Amino acid sequence: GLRNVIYINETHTRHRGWLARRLSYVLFIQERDVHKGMFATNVTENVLNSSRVQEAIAEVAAELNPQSKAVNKVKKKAKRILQEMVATVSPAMIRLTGWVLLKLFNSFFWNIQIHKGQLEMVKAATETNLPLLFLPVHRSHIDYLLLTFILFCHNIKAPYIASGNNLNIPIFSTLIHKLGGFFIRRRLDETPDGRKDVLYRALLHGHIVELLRQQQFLEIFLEGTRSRSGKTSCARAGLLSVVVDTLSTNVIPDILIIPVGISYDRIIEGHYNGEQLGWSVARGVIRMLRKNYGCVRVDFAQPFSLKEYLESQSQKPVSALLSLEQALLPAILPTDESLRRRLIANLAEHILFTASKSCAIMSTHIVACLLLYRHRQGIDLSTLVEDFFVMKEEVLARDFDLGFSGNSEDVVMHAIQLLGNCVTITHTSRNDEFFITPSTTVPSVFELNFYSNGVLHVFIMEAIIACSLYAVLNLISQEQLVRKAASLCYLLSNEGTISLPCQTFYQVCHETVGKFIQYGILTVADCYLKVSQSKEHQQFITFLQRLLGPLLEAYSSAAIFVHNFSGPVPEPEYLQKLHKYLITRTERNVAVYAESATYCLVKNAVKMFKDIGVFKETKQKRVSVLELSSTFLPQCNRQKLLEYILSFVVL
Numbered sequence: 257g258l259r260n261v262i263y264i265n266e267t268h269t270r271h272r273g274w275l276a277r278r279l280s281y282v283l284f285i286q287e288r289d290v291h292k293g294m295f296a297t298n299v300t301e302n303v304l305n306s307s308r309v310q311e312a313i314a315e316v317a318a319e320l321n322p323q324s325k326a327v328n329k330v331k332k333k334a335k336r337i338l339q340e341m342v343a344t345v346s347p348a349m350i351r352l353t354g355w356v357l358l359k360l361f362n363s364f365f366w367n368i369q370i371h372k373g374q375l376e377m378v379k380a381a382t383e384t385n386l387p388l389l390f391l392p393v394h395r396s397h398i399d400y401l402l403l404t405f406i407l408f409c410h411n412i413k414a415p416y417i418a419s420g421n422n423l424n425i426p427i428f429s430t431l432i433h434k435l436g437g438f439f440i441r442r443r444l445d446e447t448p449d450g451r452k453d454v455l456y457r458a459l460l461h462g463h464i465v466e467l468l469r470q471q472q473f474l475e476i477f478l479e480g481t482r483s484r485s486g487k488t489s490c491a492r493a494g495l496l497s498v499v500v501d502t503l504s505t506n507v508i509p510d511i512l513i514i515p516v517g518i519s520y521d522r523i524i525e526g527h528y529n530g531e532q533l534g535w536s537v538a539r540g541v542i543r544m545l546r547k548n549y550g551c552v553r554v555d556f557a558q559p560f561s562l563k564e565y566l567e568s569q570s571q572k573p574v575s576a577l578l579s580l581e582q583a584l585l586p587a588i589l590p591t592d593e594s595l596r597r598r599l600i601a602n603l604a605e606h607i608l609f610t611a612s613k614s615c616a617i618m619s620t621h622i623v624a625c626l627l628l629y630r631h632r633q634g635i636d637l638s639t640l641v642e643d644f645f646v647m648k649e650e651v652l653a654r655d656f657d658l659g660f661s662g663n664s665e666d667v668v669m670h671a672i673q674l675l676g677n678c679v680t681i682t683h684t685s686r687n688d689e690f691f692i693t694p695s696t697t698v699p700s701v702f703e704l705n706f707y708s709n710g711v712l713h714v715f716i717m718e719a720i721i722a723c724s725l726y727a728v729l730n731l732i733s734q735e736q737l738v739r740k741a742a743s744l745c746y747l748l749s750n751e752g753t754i755s756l757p758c759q760t761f762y763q764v765c766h767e768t769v770g771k772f773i774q775y776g777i778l779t780v781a782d783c784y785l786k787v788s789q790s791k792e793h794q795q796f797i798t799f800l801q802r803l804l805g806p807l808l809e810a811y812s813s814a815a816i817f818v819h820n821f822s823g824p825v826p827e828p829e830y831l832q833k834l835h836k837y838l839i840t841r842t843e844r845n846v847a848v849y850a851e852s853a854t855y856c857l858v859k860n861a862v863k864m865f866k867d868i869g870v871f872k873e874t875k876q877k878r879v880s881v882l883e884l885s886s887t888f889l890p891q892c893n894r895q896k897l898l899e900y901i902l903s904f905v906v907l
């Protein structure tokens with residue numbers, strides 16, 4: 257029971273006729289309920305006459321004086337900030353854009369998909385007069401257009417978008433303002449001199465408080481940059497802090513939060529290989545628009561009350577303070593302000609996990625995952641389809657929705673075409689059937705791994721258990737296995753999201769080991785578990801072990817490089833030196849997985865070593881220097897770290 261948003265017929269309009277059926281797209285746009293009264297009125301002057309914004313202007317004035325006529329200058333400066341921040345929505349512009357996007361999307365997307373039952377729950381959240389917060393996952397540039405367009409198509413008033421200062425340029429900026437995008441400064445720092453702009457913070461905080469006070473829907477991307485690995489990066493708690501600061505003071509009654517999972521079959525930007533490693537524009541843009549991409553599916557997670565969440569947290573016991581170093585180091589080597597700063601960081605992480613889980617599994621996503629890990633060398637089309645059907649059902653067994661819904665045979669033939677740069681379709685002698693082999697070259701591999709990462713969040717937990725089984729072997733004690741897997745969670749903590757922030761890594765592995773008993777892979781003999789020895793079960797175990805190949809091999813390779821590290825180094829210079837070493841391994845052909853050379857896994861590897869405390873980080877001016885820690889100063893300790901990460905990866 258889904259709905260296509262792009263599909264428009266004489267049935268969708270009120271008037272049916274020879275003329276009307278031709279102008280169907282125009283008739284649909286003239287039947288929307290966007291009548292201008294609902295949007296924010298007189299924002300600028302309502303922000304200027306807020307007590308704190310006046311206190312900020314009043315204090316910045318009291319700094320510049322060596323009687324006090326300089327309030328007008330800083331007030332005029334403060335007005336000029338708001339002039340280029342606040343969005344002025346024009347429903348005239350909305351309808352024109354909506355008509356253009358309906359034509360453009362219908363060209364280069366095969367369809368867009370909405371679950372009706374979900375969007376009735378968003379409609380119910382609109383029917384209550386109370387402000388909403390739409391928090392989507394950032395995948396592509398098309399994310400900005402999709403969320404607004406889907407509400408506009410169900411005549412829910414268009415949201416105000418927290419727009420990056422990057423997009424603010426002459427002429428083009430005022431078009432964004434008409435469509436509800438309000439530009440926000442990056443880093444709340446105009447210049448180092450004076451530190452934070454007390455004036456600018458007051459205006460930003462004031463604007464958001466004023467915009468929520470008039471009961472209107474807000475859209476914030478928690479991931480500052482769109483993901484280049486193909487999986488959700490770490491959260492940013494910058495704007496949520498203001499929203500919670502609003503609700504904390506009891507200036508507004510309550511806010512409803514909606515995590516939004518957007519999924520593409522093939523993103524418009526295509527591959528990311530260029531940034532994943534290290535006239536002319538006009539040719540590239542025209543070549544992009546003519547290419548027809550696959551399906552799209554936007555899912556809305558059930559909305560919750562921020563007040564009810566924030567209360568529920570205040571009832572919970574003492575938050576665990578276990579440090580990543582304090583957790584792991586024992587295994588490898590045998591505050592009033594901070595409490596709230598943790599509370600917002602947890603909320604942000606909690607939303608992104610809910611948002612990431614809501615994203616549907618596309619045909620491409622599965623095909624990539626099967627090609628890279630289940631076969632790799634190459635397999636026949638008839639054989640690939642039989643494996644595709646077995647993969648398809650495993651995703652539905654864990655309660656994830658699929659984007660593809662057609663015939664199993666066809667969907668794969670459609671999916672292979674979209675990965676045409678990565679894949680080659682040959683002919684086997686004496687076999688009237690297509691043979692497929694994925695590209696193992698460093699430029700091509702990355703593109704497959706990007707679309708393959710789409711399915712990783714389904715199997716990430718079982719994969720952590722599947723690796724632990726191999727680690728504990730080289731009968732299994734229940735307590736011993738879970739403790740081993742719990743340590744691997746802290747190691748792979750930095751990359752992606754593994755569990756909900758409320759649940760500890762122990763109990764998640766403990767219930768995942770519980771699920772392994774249900775499936776019948778492990779059987780009960782503290783308790784002793786036996787691994788089942790069947791042709792069907794083993795190929796599932798080996799699949800899950802290979803699925804954490806790149807993630808572990810990158811860390812293994814990074815840990816080897818750490819051996820020959822001398823003297824303090826700048827991090828931006830160090831990342832380049834480390835990245836080159838992983839790229840070298842793929843050229844020499846000593847590396848098992850070419851996927852591991854990706855830049856995202858280099859950032860994670862270095863950011864992970866900081867948390868364990870291999871690198872001591874003192875920072876000055878802009879760039880932070882990396883000093884070798886007192887614990888990992890000697891040669892023997894660096895080898896002990898390498899050995900531990902090696903124990904997980906297959907040999």
Ligand SMILES: CCCCCCCCCCCCCCC(=O)CSCCNC(=O)CCNC(=O)[C@H](O)C(C)(C)COP(=O)(O)OP(=O)(O)OC[C@H]1O[C@@H](n2cnc3c(N)ncnc32)[C@H](O)[C@@H]1OP(=O)(O)O
Pocket residue numbers: 350353354357400401404405408417418419420423432435437440441442443444452476477478479480481492493494495497596597598600601
């Ligand atoms: C049918 C019609 C269709 C119509 C079509 C419509 C289409 C229109 C197009 C619209 C275009 C839209 C573009 C959207 C994009 O491209 C997305 S660009 C990301 C934007 N949003 C964000 O940036 C999200 C994250 N925001 C932030 O992080 C911030 O907003 C900044 C940004 C300041 C960075 O932050 P900064 O570098 O300053 O560092 P910070 O670490 O965040 O610290 C800043 C301050 O934030 C507070 N804070 C931070 N962490 C916490 C925390 N955990 N708990 C509590 N408070 C916290 C605290 O005040 C600490 O200050 P200090 O540095 O002094 O500690």
Ligand SMILES: CCCCCCCCCCCCCCCC(=O)OC[C@@H](O)COP(=O)(O)O
Pocket residue numbers: 356360397398524525526527528529530531
């Ligand atoms: C503002 C709304 C007005 C309505 C019109 C909007 C229509 C959609 C605009 C097209 C989407 C944006 C195009 C971005 C182009 C771009 O960024 O180039 C692609 C490269 O990075 C990819 O490089 P690589 O990662 O090396 O493959």
